[PDB]
């Protein structure tokens, strides 16, 4: 059932998020948007070197409690 | 001289034959130049670190054999 994942940002945050492991990437990408502001379009996820795609799952990862994804942001930040 | 390696997400290994102080956009050009993928659409990656264009390799601490990693900022059609 319900399941703790971490998420770990480039400025060295890590972002608790309270999934399911039957949950969408998207869906992931959606809590990230909205406890950071960043549009899930402009959200990249990384899980061992490997980048996520939104239509599929956690559970096709094999990703389980207390795993820490790599979130990276698609735009470079203006300046 | 040196010789490093680039990771895809596919997990296809790219060598590459840089120089320490060869800019992290001349890099990104290489990459396009074996790979076709324009320098707009690359972010590399080095110890979980995003690298900037306008420094080079040595600004960042990497040595020969080390593996950086790079990632499409679009996402291919599929």
Same mark, same amino acid.
Not at 63 to 68: A, G, L, V, Y
């Given at each position: 059932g319900s399941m703790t994942i971490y998420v770990k940002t480039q400025d060295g945050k890590i972002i608790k998020l309270?999934?399911?492991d039957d949950d969408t990437?998207?869906?992931?990408k959606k809590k !990230?948007? #909205?406890k950071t502001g960043i549009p899930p379009e402009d959200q990249i996820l990384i899980y061992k070197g490997k980048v996520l795609e939104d239509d599929k799952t956690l559970a096709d990862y094999n !990703?389980? #409690?207390?795993?820490?994804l790599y979130l990276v942001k698609r735009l470079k930040s203006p300046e």
């Open positions: 309270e999934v399911n990437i998207l869906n992931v !990230i948007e #909205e !990703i389980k #409690e207390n795993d820490t």
